[PDB]
Design a binder for this molecule. Structure first.
Ligand SMILES: Cc1nc(C)c(-c2csc(Nc3ccc(C(=O)N4[C@@H]5CC[C@H]4CN(c4ncc(C(F)(F)F)cn4)C5)cn3)n2)s1
Lengths: 111, 545, 135
């Protein structure tokens, strides 16, 4: 519950902020309307590496689009994984005694 | 030798026989190292009282300027700066008897108001010699008190602390800028109880009811509405970063910053953030359409924001600027991002008017950098300010030198591997292969089926495993030690944001939002009340009654 | 000032001739902040044992209520809640001699069982003033 409260919301907020901003920036290079859902799905698939880059070649400028995709992937993956790991490690190394103190409280509450 | 040489009285007797006594006991050493050190300086610095009394008895000189290069601050190339007066020298070597005697003596006395070639009084010299050690701060504070009280008894006028040097600094801002916790903190919470010399205090005792003590700190120099030099701006901007945190955490300063926050700071920031988010949404909507009149209005709004950022960044040149602000995370790191985003917007507009087809690439780069800029506004909370600081540390680290030389490493190993336009093609193929989207079709064209196998294995090892491990280990090293300076630089960022918001206000608006309250803290000459802008801090203590 | 003020004996000497000695040492300050605070409260919070003895010797009161907004818990917008009685004030300001004198004196003694407006006795006030420190 501690991770869900203090950390999950920040991770989700940053992830959605980056995703929405970069997706809007990429859609700004569209060529004809409803491609929002499909393009977001393909970006999410490409985040892990299971996506298809067929629509990438349809853009006017391939170099900047490829560079921006590379930056998106590296920044999101590395930054978000590193912040998750660092925050969880710091929490478990710092407030283990506080969690010990807490558990007694709902134990007595249950009794 | 043994504290006494009998030759001095005899030599002085011969000098007075020769009738050159004024010029005999006066020694302006023409040596560039000792330019001005007379006999009185030598007598005082030897921790001798009877000889200094004997030499000053005939009235040689008491305001001799020790302008020598040896008597200069260590930063200028000297070894001991004590001011440039015998009185300042005695005060800077922990000699209470000598400084007492040099003032209340019949023959000739040194006024404490006298200034050296730098404009530094004796209190400025005491601030300069002080460091952050107990045995030093003890006598520095004690004799700073002593001198202030002594200059208050005689000459019932403006206190010695109000005399500014050639840089306009009093001892208070000199200590704030140079970074001495001892003397600065002692001055800030200075409380004198004597009826005659009570106006020297900066912390009062407004009211008390048993175990509650409402103290009333003075804000004569800490909080000035622009029309003066202030301790807080110097602390946040022009100070020793090695020691800046411990001096922003003193009794009035932190609560004064919190009061400014609650008054206008926190609410200016929320108005400042929501506006930036709205502008970013408008800019995204304008970019998504590249109705045309509406998107042209959005483009005009974006250009207005870009030119506002450009003017804000350029205007700093004629203001506080030009530190080594390339690595500082005190909004210096985000300042370059501001400027780059504004330059990208301006170049996009120019190419939109110059006909260059690369306008849209720069504009979309501006949009993405503008969202990474909207990441700025998480400084409002420590839980988010620390996150922003860490993510900006990694961005300022991850993409730079080691990744740059990693790209150069790909360049070099591609150049080594090619052929034992094909260079660029093989470079792209290897770049795809390292991530995992490449192909192994190049082995067929290899002239040596041997060597490359093991060579490619080693290349994959170094490029992936080694770099990933050292990259992860980088934040591994950082986090454990930076868990505390994360919030330290968060405090610095928050204070800088508050002060930068405060400056943009006009003088009348700053006075309207001025912190503290006017209080008649006591009487002065001719019965004039002391109307000092003071800052109340209620406290509690069950130890002294 | 300096622990003593010679005016008070002469002031009380005048007051007894004025024929209002019972009413003289009584001052329910009409101000909201200082409602009910009489002279005994001031004498006790000043840690002046002799003046407390003098004022209680004239037989004014030992059960005056300090109902003012100043004398309220910090949650209610006050600055020092010690209960609302002179004995509670003496107990909450660490004055054992004043408590001893007020409990056992010939003129008039304040019973420890008395409750203020909130119902707090002296021990409730002692609990209220206590924070988790050492001194
Ligand atoms: C790192 C940085 N560099 C720069 C140059 C930065 C900068 C400069 S200005 C700025 N951002 C601004 C500018 C101007 C205003 C603005 O109109 N205000 C201010 C003060 C009066 C008025 C209304 N407001 C307010 N007043 C009282 C309450 C109460 F009800 F609570 F009392 C609530 N709100 C806040 C807001 N925000 N940011 S920042």
């Amino acid at each position: 519950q501690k991770i869900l409260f203090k950390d999950l919301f920040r991770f989700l907020l940053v992830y959605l902020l980056f995703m929405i901003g970069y997706a809007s920036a990429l859609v700004s290079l569209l060529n004809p309307s409803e491609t929002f859902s499909t393009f977001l799905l393909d970006l999410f698939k490409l985040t892990i590496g299971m996506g298809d880059l067929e629509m990438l070649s349809s853009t006017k400028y391939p170099v900047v689009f490829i560079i921006l995709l590379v930056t998106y992937i590296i920044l999101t993956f590395v930054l978000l994984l590193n912040m998750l790991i660092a925050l969880m490690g710091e929490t478990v190394g710092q407030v283990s005694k506080e969690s010990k103190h807490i558990w007694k409280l709902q134990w007595a509450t249950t009794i | 030798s043994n504290g006494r040489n009998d030759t001095i009285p005899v030599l002085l007797d011969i000098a007075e026989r020769t009738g050159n006594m004024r010029e005999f006991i006066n020694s302006p050493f023409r040596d560039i190292y000792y330019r001005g050190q007379t006999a009185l300086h030598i007598a005082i610095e030897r921790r001798c009282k009877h000889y200094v009394e004997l030499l000053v008895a005939q009235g040689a000189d008491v305001h001799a300027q020790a302008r020598g290069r040896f008597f200069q601050p260590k930063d200028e190339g000297g070894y001991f700066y004590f001011g440039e007066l015998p009185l300042s020298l005695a005060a800077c070597t922990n000699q209470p008897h000598i400084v007492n005697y040099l003032t209340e003596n019949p023959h000739k006395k040194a006024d404490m108001r006298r200034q050296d070639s730098r404009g530094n009084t004796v209190l400025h010299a005491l601030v300069a010699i002080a460091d952050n050690t107990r045995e030093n701060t003890k006598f520095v504070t004690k004799m700073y008190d002593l001198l202030l009280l002594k200059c208050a008894r005689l000459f019932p006028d403006s206190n010695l602390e109000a005399v500014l040097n050639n840089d306009g600094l009093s001892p208070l801002m000199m200590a704030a800028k140079t970074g001495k916790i001892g003397i600065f903190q002692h001055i800030i919470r200075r409380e004198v109880t004597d009826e005659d010399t009570r106006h020297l205090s900066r912390k009062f005792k407004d009211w008390a009811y048993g175990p509650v003590y409402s103290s009333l700190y003075d804000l004569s120099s800490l909080d000035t509405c622009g029309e003066e030099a202030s301790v807080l701006e110097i602390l946040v901007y022009n100070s020793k970063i090695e020691n800046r945190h411990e001096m922003l955490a003193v009794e009035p300063i932190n609560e004064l910053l919190r009061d400014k926050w609650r008054k206008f700071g926190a609410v200016s920031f929320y108005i400042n953030v929501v506006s930036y988010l709205c502008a970013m949404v408008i800019f995204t909507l304008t970019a998504y359409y590249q109705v045309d009149y509406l998107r042209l209005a959005g483009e005009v709004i974006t250009l207005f924001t870009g030119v506002l950022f450009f003017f804000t960044n350029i205007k700093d040149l004629f203001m506080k600027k030009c530190p080594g602000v390339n690595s500082l995370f005190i909004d210096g790191s985000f300042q370059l991002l501001y400027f780059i985003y504004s330059v990208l917007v301006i170049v996009s507009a120019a190419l939109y008017l110059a006909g260059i087809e690369a306008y849209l690439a720069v504009m979309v780069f501006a949009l993405v950098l503008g969202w990474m800029n909207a990441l700025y506004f998480t400084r409002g909370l420590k839980l988010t300010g620390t996150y922003s600081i860490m993510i900006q540390k990694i961005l300022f680290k991850d993409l730079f030198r080691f990744l740059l030389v990693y790209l150069l490493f790909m360049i070099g190993y591609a150049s080594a591997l090619v052929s034992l336009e094909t260079f660029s093609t093989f470079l792209l193929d290897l770049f795809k292969l390292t991530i995992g989207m490449g192909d192994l079709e190049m082995l067929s064209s290899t002239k040596y089926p041997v060597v490359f196998i093991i060579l490619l294995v080693t290349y994959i090892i170094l490029t992936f495993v080694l770099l990933l491990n050292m990259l992860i280990a980088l934040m591994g090293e950082t986090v454990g030690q930076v868990s505390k300076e994360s919030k330290h630089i968060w405090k610095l960022q928050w204070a800088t944001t508050i002060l930068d918001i405060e400056r943009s206000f006009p003088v009348f608006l700053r006075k309207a939002f001025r912190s503290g309250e006017m209080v008649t803290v006591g009487k002065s000459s001719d019965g004039t009340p002391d109307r000092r802008w003071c800052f109340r801090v209620d406290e509690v203590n069950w130890s002294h009654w």
